[PDB]
């Protein structure tokens, strides 16, 4: 059984600077295993995210060493080993399930205490359209080596989580589809430009969301940079 493949995760944690935090991340088909090659994520207001670990337990170039991951027991682990007011965040894990990545609910973690980047995925801000109608959204990778990178797609509707659209490899142009997203939305790319690109189709106000790209490859982090995510909305 893996058709209702769910992650969990703390609902809320507090924490204050020089302590300790550990996040966890459980599947429901069983214990988190390697295979599941998990990522953790953070957003930061207004919807920015970095991710900070890749395949179970690498930390990213550039993420503060106090973040670590590891699988301890039956679950996927991000430990802040002295947190810092920056650290307020919502905090996502993703684990990949065979064919399909699974983001958890989110934690959001409260740090009491308050008061360029070479890889860029460049998103447009904004885009509206009409129910019933099909829309384009686009995703330009900037200083790195687009076609040696998968480009990932994900939405966050309001006021909600992550949810995996599906992704695609740029040089043998293979495409998978999270079963929810398959009727939904169509990726193409194009290497010359560095541009991935997203229709959505036949369009309702369920659609209303955040949708974000993000890299990937085989054995990297994936979702280590995110685009700034283009709000739509579909109205009349
Ligand atoms: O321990 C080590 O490093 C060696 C083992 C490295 C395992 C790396 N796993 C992934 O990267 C997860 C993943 C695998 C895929 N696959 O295998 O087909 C995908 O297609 C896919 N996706 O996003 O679509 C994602």
């Known amino acids: 059984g893996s058709a209702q493949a769910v992650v969990t995760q703390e609902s809320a944690l507090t924490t204050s600077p020089g302590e300790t935090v550990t996040l966890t991340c459980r599947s429901s088909?069983?214990?988190?295993?390697?295979?599941?090659?998990v990522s953790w994520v953070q957003e930061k207001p207004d919807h920015l995210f970095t991710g900070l670990i890749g395949?179970?337990?690498n930390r990213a170039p550039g993420v503060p060493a106090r973040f670590s991951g590891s699988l301890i027991g039956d679950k996927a682990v991000l430990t802040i080993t002295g947190a810092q007011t920056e650290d307020e965040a919502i905090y996502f894990c993703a684990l990949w399930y065979s064919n399909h990545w699974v983001f958890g609910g989110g934690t959001k973690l409260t740090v009491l205490g308050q008061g360029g980047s070479q890889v860029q995925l460049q998103q447009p801000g904004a885009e509206l359209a009409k129910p019933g109608a099909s829309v384009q959204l686009s995703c330009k990778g900037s200083g790195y080596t687009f076609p040696n990178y998968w480009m990932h797609w994900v939405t966050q509707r309001p006021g909600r989580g992550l949810e995996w659209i599906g992704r695609?490899?740029?040089?043998?142009?293979?495409?998978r589809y999270d079963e929810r997203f398959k009727t939904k939305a169509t990726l193409t790319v194009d290497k010359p430009s560095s541009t991935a690109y997203m229709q959505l189709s036949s369009l309702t106000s369920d659609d209303s969301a955040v949708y974000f790209c993000?890299?990937?490859?085989?054995?990297?982090?994936?979702?280590?940079?995110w685009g700034q995510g283009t709000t739509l909305t579909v109205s009349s």
């Open positions: 088909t069983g214990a988190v295993i390697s295979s599941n090659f």
């Open positions: 993000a890299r990937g490859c085989y054995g990297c982090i994936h979702f280590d940079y």
């Open positions: 695609i490899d740029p040089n043998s142009g293979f495409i």
């Open positions: 395949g179970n337990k």
